[PDB]
């Protein structure tokens, strides 16, 4: 009977970076997905490698929900198969993702007047992310063939930049909320059921 | 809206010293980077230095670094590109446009950069 | 520092579809941007860093982002269109721009 908490999920008043996004595993509830594509609040919902109808029919083992937030121009690079910052440093989706993407705008609560700088993303790493792999790290990375001793110099950078987010900006640079459910099959009962199976 | 209004380029011969300026209008000047980049008649654009939201971040390019210094006073919304020991080569046509991209440079990612606004065609005139 | 190439000199008819590839040379770029430049004025950036363009543009140009290649597609050619196109990499701070593409719609 106990639903899954996506509520505990969507509407968190805090939201952790992309660099570092955050995960909360879902199991054992009940999924109530109607209340997701019933409404016009998600900018960006593509559901990958599942049905576009038997959403609420669906019974998977386990659910995994990536939330992070990345600024107007980085959702499309939230999708399997994608060369991007994002796609590459930060998130990197594989190319057999099954699983529903859900985006949208909050230029009014992770935004205020002056700066909110809270909010970072890795922009520099000697090698493209695998898929589900959460990198943290914290070193000068070394851009030129110019060796590094961690010092702060011309190729040699903090590896995450901050994000500038005031209510006075471009569309492409506003910040959304971004929430990424990943249905996770394994060989094993299901855990997480709809209402309508 | 916004304007990178530029004035004071002028004529002057190989060896002195003339400094330009890029006066800014609308947009917050105290949190985008500036850039300056000239075009030569008839050739392409080439760039030149940069300043970081005043956090003394210079960077200059290469022909460039001990001649040109940059300059900007965000209290007066304006930027400044000194120059000295003209190399008679520099005459082009100089251009400063806004940045918020850049790593160490501007504090936080804030819109695209190089939004051009350039004038001001500056030539490096012999004796 | 990189030597970035593009095809130049480039002619077709009003309403086409044409295409510049700005390839980049060592330390792969990546988010390259895409300027316009009419005779007599200033360069105007067209797409952000290798997509998602501005608001402005009529909406006739785009871009794919790729590591080391890029490409700069424009669709329904114009009259008034003729300019010099220029792709600028920054990832390091000694920025080079492209070789510029003439165009010059075939009548």
């Known amino acids: 009977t106990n639903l899954c908490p996506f509520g505990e999920v969507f509407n968190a008043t805090r939201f952790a970076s992309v660099y570092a996004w955050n995960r909360k595993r879902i199991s054992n509830c009940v999924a109530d997905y109607s209340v997701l594509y019933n409404s016009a609040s998600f900018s960006t919902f593509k559901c990958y490698g599942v049905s576009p109808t038997k959403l609420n029919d669906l019974c998977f083992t386990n659910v995994y929900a990536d939330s992070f937030v990345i600024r107007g121009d980085e959702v499309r690079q939230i999708a399997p198969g994608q060369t991007g910052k994002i796609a590459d440093y930060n998130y990197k989706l594989p190319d057999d993702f099954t699983g529903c993407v859900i985006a949208w705008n909050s230029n009014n609560l992770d935004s205020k007047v002056g700066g909110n700088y809270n909010y970072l993303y890795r922009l520099f790493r000697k090698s493209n992310l695998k898929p589900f792999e959460r990198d943290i790290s914290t070193e000068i990375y070394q851009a030129g063939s110019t060796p590094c001793n961690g010092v702060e110099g011309f190729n040699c950078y903090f590896p995450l930049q901050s994000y500038g987010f005031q209510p006075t900006n471009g569309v492409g640079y506003q910040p959304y909320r971004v929430v990424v459910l990943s249905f996770e099959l394994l060989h094993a009962p299901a855990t997480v059921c709809g209402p309508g199976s | 809206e916004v304007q990178l209004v530029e004035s004071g380029g002028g004529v002057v011969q190989p060896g002195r010293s003339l400094r330009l300026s890029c006066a800014a209008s609308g947009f917050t000047f105290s949190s985008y980077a500036m850039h300056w980049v000239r075009q030569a008649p008839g050739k392409g654009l080439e760039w030149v230095a940069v300043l970081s939201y005043d956090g003394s971040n210079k960077y200059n390019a290469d022909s460039v670094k001990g001649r040109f210094t940059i300059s900007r006073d965000n209290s007066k919304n304006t930027l400044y590109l000194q120059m000295n020991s003209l190399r008679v080569e520099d005459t082009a046509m100089y251009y400063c446009?806004?940045?918020?991209?850049?790593?160490?440079?501007?504090?936080?990612?804030?819109?695209?950069?190089?939004?051009?606004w350039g004038q001001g065609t500056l030539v490096t005139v012999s004796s | 520092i990189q030597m970035t190439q593009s095809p130049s000199s480039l002619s077709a008819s009003v309403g086409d579809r044409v295409t510049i590839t700005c390839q980049t040379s060592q330390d792969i770029s990546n988010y390259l941007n895409w300027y316009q430049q009419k005779p007599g004025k200033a360069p105007k950036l067209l797409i952000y860093d290798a997509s998602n363009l501005e608001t402005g543009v009529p909406s006739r140009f785009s871009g794919s982002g790729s590591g080391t290649d890029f490409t700069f597609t424009i669709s329904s050619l114009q009259p008034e269109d003729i300019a010099t196109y220029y792709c600028?990499?920054?990832?390091?701070?000694?920025?080079?721009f492209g070789g510029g593409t003439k165009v010059d719609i075939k009548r």
């Open positions: 446009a806004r940045d918020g991209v850049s790593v160490t440079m501007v504090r936080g990612v804030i819109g695209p950069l190089c939004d051009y």
């Open positions: 600028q990499q920054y990832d390091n701070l000694p920025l080079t």
